[PDB]
Write a protein that binds this DNA or RNA. Sequence first.
RNA 1: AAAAAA
Lengths: 613, 615
Amino acid sequence: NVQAHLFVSLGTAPAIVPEAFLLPGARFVSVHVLTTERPDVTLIREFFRRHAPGVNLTITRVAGFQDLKSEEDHFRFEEVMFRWFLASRTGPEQRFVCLTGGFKTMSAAMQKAATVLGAAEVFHVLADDCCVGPQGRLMPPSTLEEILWARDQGHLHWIRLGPERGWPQLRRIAPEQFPLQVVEEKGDERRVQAEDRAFGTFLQDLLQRASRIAGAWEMLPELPFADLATWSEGELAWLREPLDPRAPADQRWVAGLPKIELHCHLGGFATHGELLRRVRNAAENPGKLPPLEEPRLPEGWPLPAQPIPLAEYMKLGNANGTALLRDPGCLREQCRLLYRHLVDQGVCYAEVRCSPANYAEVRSPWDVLADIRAAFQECMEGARTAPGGLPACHVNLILIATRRASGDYRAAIARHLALAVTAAEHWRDENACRVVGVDLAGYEDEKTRAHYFREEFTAVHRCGLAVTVHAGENDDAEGIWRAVFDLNARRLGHALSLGQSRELLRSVADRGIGVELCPYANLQIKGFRLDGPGPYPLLDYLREGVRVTVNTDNIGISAASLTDNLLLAARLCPGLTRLDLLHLQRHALETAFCTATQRLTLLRRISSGIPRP
Amino acid sequence: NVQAHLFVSLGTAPAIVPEAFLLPGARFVSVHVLTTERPDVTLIREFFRRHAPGVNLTITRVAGFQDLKSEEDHFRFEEVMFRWFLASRTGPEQRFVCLTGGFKTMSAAMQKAATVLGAAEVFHVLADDCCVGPQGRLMPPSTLEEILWARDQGHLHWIRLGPERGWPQLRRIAPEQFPLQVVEEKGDERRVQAEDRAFGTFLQDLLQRASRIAGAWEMLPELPFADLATWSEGELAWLREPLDPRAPADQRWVAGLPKIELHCHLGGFATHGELLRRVRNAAENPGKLPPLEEPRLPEGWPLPAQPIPLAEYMKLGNANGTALLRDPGCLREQCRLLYRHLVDQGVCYAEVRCSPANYAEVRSPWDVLADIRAAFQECMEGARTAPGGLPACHVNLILIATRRASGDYRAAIARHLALAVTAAEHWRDENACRVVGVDLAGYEDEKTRAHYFREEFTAVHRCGLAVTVHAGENDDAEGIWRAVFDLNARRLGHALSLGQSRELLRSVADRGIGVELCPYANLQIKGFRLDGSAPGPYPLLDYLREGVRVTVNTDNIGISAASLTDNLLLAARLCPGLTRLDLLHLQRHALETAFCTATQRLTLLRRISSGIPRP
RNA sequence: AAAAAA
Ligand SMILES: Nc1ncnc2c1ncn2[C@@H]1O[C@H](COP(=O)(O)OP(=O)(O)OP(=O)(O)O)[C@@H](O)[C@H]1O
């Protein structure tokens, strides 16, 4: 609109600037001149002194650019040129960039700047030979007397290349982001200088990410996250090859992924090693802790030769069962230790399962739950990091029915649900460690306890809590079927035997009900064909559309972290692409019991968290 | 190991090319000089004849452009240059451009070409003033010794600006796609001219789209469809300001959206006007159809002054339905007319609700449904243009289960639910119309709420089928809770009494049950106030803010006398502040709650994303 | 029309 500015760069031909100034339809108000620390400017100053009263010249000079010996001379020019544009607070509709003067690279740089910063008009001034001069037919060099005579004689030509819109986040920036080091500036004649070439790096990053996103924009629906669209073709191709857990490069990459944990038990964290001693070393009543009875693991335990029944499986964690956690001091220590382990693993969101009733001899179950929530809430507050001041790992609680088989069962589940329902109401802050769901494994499978569970669990749905059902031993399709439809569960633990029931598998995928697989737990309790009991159903379920996640289950009892869980899934199912591991994380995100606002934050937190190769 | 081609532009001062060819550390082949109907090339040809046996020189002359006079002169050169780049094969790893020579615009265009097209090296040749002549200390302009002396003495510089990435879709394109028309040619040198400005607009299209997609990226998730993020800043700004139903510009826009219909009844539709007459002219037993008696619609039926109740609304339009659609010709014509209506309305996916067992004297309900399915399937085969050679509109079927007041209606429910199980499993062709769900419609009452048919619906869940329900049509939130948790419903119909119970509203949003609303019918039954002028406020805008997956459907088109576009337009008029962005959320919500395979859901996602029209 | 607008 108003206040059209002019950006021109000249070499040793001073007449360029006055020629470009009187571009037909100019109405200029401030001409800016870019020089090279050689040519005289007394003519441009003279021209704009006699018949250009207010034009507000700025003659930038680019210190230390006398000649063009090497490209380092040119690179110093590009950084100065870009910062020179921003030093004048001018919009795209005000720049009338002219590319005429200086070396060809100097002029070509002016073209690039206008395209990637926006310019209302980019033109180039010509002058046919009409000044007679000493030798015949010289273009007009002779001050104002001939330049004015050139305009009215129909000599100067203005080839205009039209406007340039420029990139949406380049056409304002701010001059203070990339300041100019003024050195030795006289009246309206400044020798600018740049301390670093940050803008050149900043601009290059933006063009290449814009190129990558455009080159891979055809298939965003398949890409689990948006940030993967900013990857090179090679990296994207590398992402679709089968995972190689043997390769150290793959192992490092998986360890760096932001992960989501959904099936982790608080009572099976530190059952061996130094961690068990750490819990015992922090006890309020050291006289009452049972003697060290660390169990003996099966030969080659992390990858056992033969599967073991669940009876011997749970017995591997007696050293850290209810015996050690009845003391309130040990309970806080383990929660801190488990939280620290999760952050080291890189988990951005976890749902630690727990059963406060088991750890309640003198204190009430509510005291156990209050201590558990306080222990996690303290850690989340203390481990304050990440953008926006959000906790490094957000931990929610899911309550499990007591593993104890003695005592009345109807009341035991009644206490379980009643504790959870009031727990959800007691702690209601969204960003705090909040109880989000219940587990209903062990309440059924007792003289056809489906009917009792189908009516004594309606309170959970009425109060708004979530329900996850951990399918037990020899999970039949009917047992899963009632878990999906009779009691409205939203996640099914394990449930390996689901491919047999094709119709149920269609129903699970269609309703988007999550499935919580855990490799080492499954391998160490049921046995599966490792490398080259049927095949592990992880790959098959994912192709169908089942919301499948990879979790840890017990950590200490399995002696394997979540990072190891993802690696083993490749060994259990040869064929997992590195893209698939990212799908599992998104499936965990979209089936977690967090809220919509928290889900969006995790999605973008995970999106810009994936380590590039 | 690369072949290392060279690209260079020539002005009136030749011998640039030998200098460019003498770039240290590269054995170039197939030099590709540019000239413009003027500069001499004898010196360049001689140099390669005598000092470069087989480096395969080529020269092009760029059309009838000989003196820079207007922008059309430059624009002609630019597109000739770009095609000349493509005509030369091979990609970035081979290119060695040299922006030296020619006009300033020619040099500037050369660098831009390498930037947006890929180049292994961009350099510029500077010749020192180390030769003599009429002036003295002059350039090495001519001769063979001077250039060779320039190299051997070493007073040449070759400032190198480093390689460029180049946009991957612009690294090869295809020379055949953008041919460079060739005019009179001798050996080596030739003259070419571009017929149209095809490449310039193509490249401008990519960069313009890349700019918009880059800026509107940090907030992409707020966009329902990814393809939306290629619009101007104003267009995005215009898309967020509230919809104006009265504005003709918006009315034409909404009529252009690709819609998805989830809640539409075959029993219904044409009940007045020419549409009903058309059906009865296709009957194959004209003597059996009942006489012409179309029930009298109340005053201003599209926007009635008073809310009629549910019992009356069902009997509005009895001239079409159980009585009329008994002739097999009438049933086929109903399906044909609805499909044409849907395609004209722009719907890309519909789920027509029907009750085939309502139509049986000699034709069994299976026969009637087979005819309905065949009637739609042949229509989909007919109007099979679409994008990608698909059906124009994909129509699926949901069998209704009515429960009126009395009689042996539960046997009809038992028959519909059993029929759906057999039918859905029988027609497994993914690309063809097939029964995908059941329904629970009719008279909603506390006596027959949602859960008195839980024993009846067990078979449907076992076989695997979607289940909808009309919970909340006129009952409280408790009816909705029964439908969600005792029937395991996947889509609630007309769930208006849902905002009262906060836990249910959160539970529905968290699980993802789609709430099927319909503006005209809800205005014509519960009498919601219009234009923000007592049933209460309409919850459409409330549901979207809370995150409940909601969609705007049509119910009976003829009985409500309003199409899908009318329903969408009325929603903004009936819920003030409804942004045009929210209309796209409804389509996204409808897509993610529709009963269809994942493969089809992906296909619709791309089709709807590209179908959204700019203002 | 390469070290400085044709
Ligand atoms: N908007 C609506 N809300 C609730 N129930 C509806 C609505 N529209 C139709 N119904 C009921 O759903 C079923 C739809 O029947 P359909 O349209 O296939 O045939 P019909 O000949 O019109 O039926 P009928 O005379 O029994 O209502 C019937 O039970 C109808 O009462």
